[PDB]
């Protein structure tokens, strides 16, 4: 089958392409405009192995300018990961690119899929739609985003439901929870903190560091994401959380990094970022039931993998 | 008290300004860009009736091209009605104006209101955020829009929540259910059916006519809207349905119009429109508690008042 992966040069997209191309029966088309927080130099590094594979076609174009008829021709499955991520930079004049790349891109892809015969349109969304919630969050919970980023991602999901119900586009929504590992974007906490610790520079903590996340190792995320394509059971119209093995605070993470490096971190405590929840915590019962999803990578192992990646990168 | 009304030249905004100007204490500033489905000659008449009153100031500008800081310095209350409406015409290349005027306009107003001292930011939303449910919908129900229009309006609501929680903007959300009466937009059902019945033409019905609406007479909508300003209760942060006295199907409305005109009408049944709900039905429990809201205008009285307006308009 032929699979389109949007945002194929990004953190998660590049890994997903690599995992799909392990199946010799799969051909992948990747499209990426090299925008968002990650410098082009890092994205080039993300796709260098992919571009050698004869079953990978790479298109460096904006989805809003590209020929979507040409892009979607004989596509069987769409993985839509293209987006602008980032809570802090989603305020004031920085908001327009979130609207353009998270809302308009999703509408224009879904429009182009109306007369195509897809098996699946697998739309990647975020735990950021939930906002500030207590306990493990299930997919039937009323989302109240806390950031403009989260609002634009939730509008994407809502467009998926619109095109599903009206035009029978076979949508599946995955909500990822803070993904980390090799190739993590340089604006995310583990990349920043590891880079800072390697350079013997202060570790930047937003707020007091007691905030927690459901951190999801990249190989766990990708196993869940591939399972959504490979299942034969009807998951069309479903929203599925994809979460991690072990939750932790930023202080817990820094302690674990200090154990890996054998260094002691200098900490700088900055003001809390408006729009960030204090806690995220997935209920992954539904992914367990529908996808046989079970995350298996510990934080200690995942963090050493990212630590090694960042050290080698710089 | 000085009140900014966005979309002041429109159907509901012109009525809202009219009602506020009846209170000598209130100074009103209307802003309208003359865009959306209604031709600018009908909106000229709206602004002309308001401009009779010395306590009314009109600004003919796009909200995205105005010095909002300067405009808002002396504003106590914002009523935000400016939007592109239209469930039916929000598809394909028509979608971008919905995103620009329903999402970016809301974000930019909220941004300008961050450091203003406002009593209240009263944001007007729509039953179109809900999509499809069995009985009367509560404001706490998980909304899944059926139309791109609905997605854009729900994104505006979510932007209100984000700015309320992060910057303490005193937001109130009103979800209107299909508003009708004198000055109703020409693209809405009652305007079209009345005009068609007056001109002895086939009544155009999109689907089988068994669609039903919680039709809200304009004077009832405006009484609940003014009560959001004047209520003794604390409603900051609340979402409040504003619905009508009597629910009816389009077939039911046609029989009531036949009663009023003293004519038998010719029906033209057309294709159902994608993105429209089959039923809308507000639970107005919350408006009754928080706003003392009770709709008083029957369909027979309201349709007669709209009939008289349409007969005079052409
Ligand atoms: N990384 C996480 O922790 C996380 C958590 C939740 C959800 N997500 C979601 O997962 C997806 C992937 O995230 P990521 O961390 O890999 O981000 P990323 O920035 O590394 O990758 C996304 C890619 O999308 C591309 N893109 C954006 N707009 C485009 C457009 N108009 N045309 C073409 N390409 C465009 C960018 O160039 C970028 O390489 C996103 O949808 C994000 O919202 C990620
Ligand atoms: N009429 C209904 O039945 C109904 C039902 C539910 C909700 N609503 C909501 O009520 C509000 C008013 O609806 P209406 O029927 O009076 O519509 P309308 O089109 O008559 O009025 C809206 C006005 O907003 C103005 N506007 C749009 N974008 C603008 C911008 N960028 N700058 C300045 N002005 C701008 C337009 O020129 C227009 O006059 C809208 O928010 C709509 O979503 C209406
Ligand atoms: O340099 C940093 C970057 C992020 N964070 C915090 O680390 C957490 C995780 O952020 P990350 O960017 O990993 O993922 P997010 O949860 O935003 O998707 C958030 O609470 C941020 O407040 C931090 O303390 N220092
Ligand atoms: O000429 C028309 C216009 C509208 N409608 C239908 O009338 C209902 C009410 O549409 P209106 O525009 O009044 O309000 P909406 O509910 O879209 O805000 C919808 O089911 C439309 O499909 C119709 O049958 N004929």
Is A218 in contact with A180 (CB distance < 8 Å)? yes
Does the CB atom of residue A87 touch ligand 3 within 6 A? Answer: yes
Establish whether A180 is a catalytic residue. Answer: no
Alpha-carbon dihedral A255, A216, B161, B72, rounded to 10 degrees: 70
Which residues does chain A break after (C to N > 2.5 Å)? none
Is B29 in contact with B75 (CB distance < 8 Å)? yes
Backbone angles phi, psi at B64, to 5 degrees: -85, 0
CA dihedral sign of residues B244, B246, B250, B255: negative
Best CA proximity match to A150, nearest among B306, B161, B82, B262:
B161
The token duo for B146 is 């059926």
Is B276 in contact with B88 (CB distance < 8 Å)? yes
The token duo for B73 is 């310095």
B23: CB partners within 8 A, 6+ apart? none
CA atoms within 13 A on the CB side of A290: 22
CB atoms within 10 A of CB B25: 7
Query: Residue B172: helix, strand or coil by DSSP?
Result: strand
Whether residue B162 and residue A275 make contact (CB cut-off 8 A), yes or no, is: yes
Structural Rg of chain A based on CA atoms:
19
State whether residue A99 sits within 8 Å of chain B by CB: yes
- Report the alpha-carbon distance of residue B157 to residue B128 in Å, rounded: 12
- Exposed, middle or buried by CB within 10 Å (0-12, 13-18, 19+), for A69? exposed
Is B280 in contact with B233 (CB distance < 8 Å)? no
Residue whose structure tokens are 């979309």: B7
- Report the alpha-carbon distance of residue B251 to residue B248 in Å, rounded: 8
Is A128 in contact with A84 (CB distance < 8 Å)? no
How far is CA B20 from each of CA B25, B29, B49, B55, B221, rounded to the nearest angstrom? 9, 11, 13, 10, 13
- Report the alpha-carbon distance of residue A219 to residue A181 in Å, rounded: 8
- Report the alpha-carbon distance of residue B94 to residue B106 in Å, rounded: 19
- Report the alpha-carbon distance of residue B73 to residue A51 in Å, rounded: 56
Read off the DSSP letter of residue B99: I
The token duo for B299 is 């369909």
Is B20 in contact with B223 (CB distance < 8 Å)? no
Residue whose CA is at the smallest distance from ligand 4 atom 16: B178
Whether residue B155 and residue A159 make contact (CB cut-off 8 A), yes or no, is: no
Residues of B involved in catalysis: 149
What's the distance, CA A21 to chain centroid? 19
Whether residue B145 and residue A158 make contact (CB cut-off 8 A), yes or no, is: yes
Q: Give chain A positions within 8 Å (CB) of B131.
A: 165
The token duo for A225 is 């994401």
CB atoms within 10 A of CB A143: 24
B7: CB partners within 8 A, 6+ apart? B13, B31, B32, B80, B81, B82, B83
Does the CB atom of residue B192 touch ligand 4 within 6 A? Answer: yes
B310: CB partners within 8 A, 6+ apart? B191, B194, B195, B198
Whether residue A148 and residue B96 make contact (CB cut-off 8 A), yes or no, is: no
Distance from A95 to chain B by nearest Cα, in Å? Answer: 8
Does the CB atom of residue A204 touch ligand 3 within 6 A? Answer: yes
Query: Residue B68: helix, strand or coil by DSSP?
Result: helix
Name the residue among B95, B107, B146 with its Cβ closest to that of A148.
Answer: B107
Is A113 in contact with A39 (CB distance < 8 Å)? no
CB atoms within 10 A of CB B267: 12
State whether residue B154 sits within 8 Å of chain A by CB: yes
Read off the DSSP letter of residue B129: G
Mapped to the 3 state alphabet, what secondary structure does chain A carry? Answer: CEEEEECCCCHHHHHHHHHHCCCCCCEEEEECCCCCCCCHHHHHHHHHHHHHCCCEEEECCCCCCCCHHHHHCCCCEEEECCCCCCCHHHCHHHCHHHHHHHHHHHHHHHHHCCCCCCCEEEEEEEHHHCCCCCCCECCCCCCCCCCHHHHHHHHHHHHHHHHHHHHCCCEEEEEECCEECCCCCCCCHHHHHHHHHHCCCCEEEECCCCCEECCEEHHHHHHHHHHHHHCCCCCCCCEEEECCCCCEEHHHHHHHHHHHHCCCCCEEEECCCCCCCCECCECCHHHHHHHCCCCCCCHHHHHHHHHHHHHHHC
Choosing from A26, A79, A98, A149, which is the catalytic residue?
A: A149
State whether residue B254 sits within 8 Å of chain A by CB: no
Q: What distance in angstroms lies between residue A36's CA and the mean position of ligand 3's atoms?
A: 17
- Report the alpha-carbon distance of residue B2 to residue B75 in Å, rounded: 5
Read off the DSSP letter of residue B4: E
* Pairs from B90-98 (Cβ < 8 Å, separation ≥ 24): B90/B147, B90/B148, B90/B149, B90/B152, B90/B275, B91/A111, B91/B148, B91/B274, B91/B275, B92/A111, B95/A104, B95/A107, B95/B148, B96/A104, B97/B35, B98/B148, B98/B149, B98/B152
- Report the alpha-carbon distance of residue A30 to residue B189 in Å, rounded: 45
Whether residue A104 and residue B95 make contact (CB cut-off 8 A), yes or no, is: yes
Is A7 in contact with A32 (CB distance < 8 Å)? yes
Interface probe, candidates B128, B151, B153, B277, chain A, greatest A C-beta count within 10 A? B151
Q: What distance in angstroms lies between residue A188's CA and the mean position of ligand 3's atoms?
A: 6
Whether residue A162 and residue B152 make contact (CB cut-off 8 A), yes or no, is: no
- Report the alpha-carbon distance of residue B243 to residue A47 in Å, rounded: 54
Best CA proximity match to A135, nearest among A289, A281, A286:
A281
Is B142 in contact with B93 (CB distance < 8 Å)? no
Method: X-ray
- Report the alpha-carbon distance of residue A50 to residue A72 in Å, rounded: 20
Query: Residue B234: helix, strand or coil by DSSP?
Result: coil
How far is CA B33 from each of CA A79, A297, B9, B47, rounded to the nearest angstrom? 39, 55, 8, 12
Best CA proximity match to B161, nearest among A140, A154, A283:
A154
Backbone angles phi, psi at B126, to 5 degrees: -150, 150
Strand partners, B217: B180
Is A174 in contact with A219 (CB distance < 8 Å)? no
Chain A and chain B share a number of CB contacts under 8 A equal to: 78
Q: What distance in angstroms lies between residue B107's CA and the mean position of ligand 4's atoms?
A: 29
CA dihedral sign of residues A206, A208, A209, A214: negative
Ligand 1 atom index nearest CA of A85: 43
How many helices (H) does chain B have, and how many strands (E)? 11, 13
- Report the alpha-carbon distance of residue A28 to residue A20 in Å, rounded: 8
State whether residue A278 sits within 8 Å of chain B by CB: no
State whether residue B278 sits within 8 Å of chain A by CB: no
Distance from A274 to chain B by nearest Cα, in Å? Answer: 6
Helix H or strand E encompassing B126: strand B120-126
Nearest 5°: the CA angle A15, A20, A26 is: 150
- Exposed, middle or buried by CB within 10 Å (0-12, 13-18, 19+), for A238? middle
Ligand 1 atom index nearest CA of A105: 31
Query: Residue B59: helix, strand or coil by DSSP?
Result: strand
Residue whose CA is at the smallest distance from ligand 4 atom 20: B211
Q: Give chain B positions within 8 Å (CB) of A104.
A: 95-96, 99
Alpha-carbon dihedral B148, B149, B151, B155, rounded to 10 degrees: 140
Name the residue among B91, B154, B166 with its Cβ closest to that of A275.
Answer: B166
Nearest 5°: the CA angle B295, B300, B306 is: 90
Q: What is the DSSP string of B252-306?
A: HHHHHHHHHHT-PPPEEEEPPPTT--SB--B--HHHHHHH-------HHHHHHHH
Nearest 5°: the CA angle B176, B178, B182 is: 105
Mapped to the 3 state alphabet, what secondary structure does B71-86 carry? Answer: HHCCCCEEEECCCCCC
- Report the alpha-carbon distance of residue B292 to residue B223 in Å, rounded: 10
Whether residue A161 and residue B144 make contact (CB cut-off 8 A), yes or no, is: yes
Best CA proximity match to B193, nearest among B213, B221, B175:
B213
Is B259 in contact with B228 (CB distance < 8 Å)? no
Burial A215-228 (b: 16+ CB within 10 A, else e): bbbbbbbbbbbbbb
């Amino acid at each position: 089958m032929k699979i389109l992966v949007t945002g194929a040069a990004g953190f998660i997209g590049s890994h997903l392409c690599q995992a799909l191309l392990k199946n010799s029966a799969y051909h992948v088309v990747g499209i990426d405009h090299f925008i968002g927080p990650t410098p082009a130099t890092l994205k080039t590094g993300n796709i260098q192995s992919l571009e050698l594979n004869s079953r990978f076609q790479f298109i460096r174009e904006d989805i809003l300018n590209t020929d979507l008829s040409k892009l979607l021709q004989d596509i069987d499955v769409v993985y839509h990961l293209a987006a602008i991520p980032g809570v802090r930079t989603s305020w004031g004049k920085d908001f327009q690119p979130y609207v353009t790349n998270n809302i308009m891109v999703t509408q224009q892809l879904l429009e182009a899929c109306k007369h195509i015969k897809l098996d699946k349109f697998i739309h990647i969304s975020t735990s950021s739609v939930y906002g500030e919630k207590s306990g493990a969050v299930s997919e039937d919970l009323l989302p109240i985003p806390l950031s403009p980023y989260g609002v634009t991602k939730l509008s994407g999901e809502h467009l998926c439901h619109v095109y599903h119900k009206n035009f029978h586009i076979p949508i599946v929504i995955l909500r990822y929870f803070t993904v980390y590992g090799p190739r993590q974007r340089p604006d995310m906490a583990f990349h920043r903190l590891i880079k800072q610790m390697l350079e013997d520079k202060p570790l930047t903590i937003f707020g007091d560091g007691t905030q927690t996340r459901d951190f999801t190792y990249i190989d766990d995320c990708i196993r869940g994401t591939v399972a959504a394509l490979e299942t034969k059971k009807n998951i069309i119209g479903e929203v599925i959380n994809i979460g991690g093995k072990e939750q932790a605070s930023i202080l817990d993470i820094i302690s674990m990094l200090e154990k890996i490096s054998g260094k002691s971190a200098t900490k700088n405590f900055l003001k809390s970022v408006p729009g960030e929840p204090k806690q995220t915590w997935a209920d992954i019962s539904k992914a367990s039931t529908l996808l046989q999803y079970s995350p298996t990578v510990s934080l200690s192992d995942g963090l050493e993998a990212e630590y090694d990646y960042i050290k080698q990168l710089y």
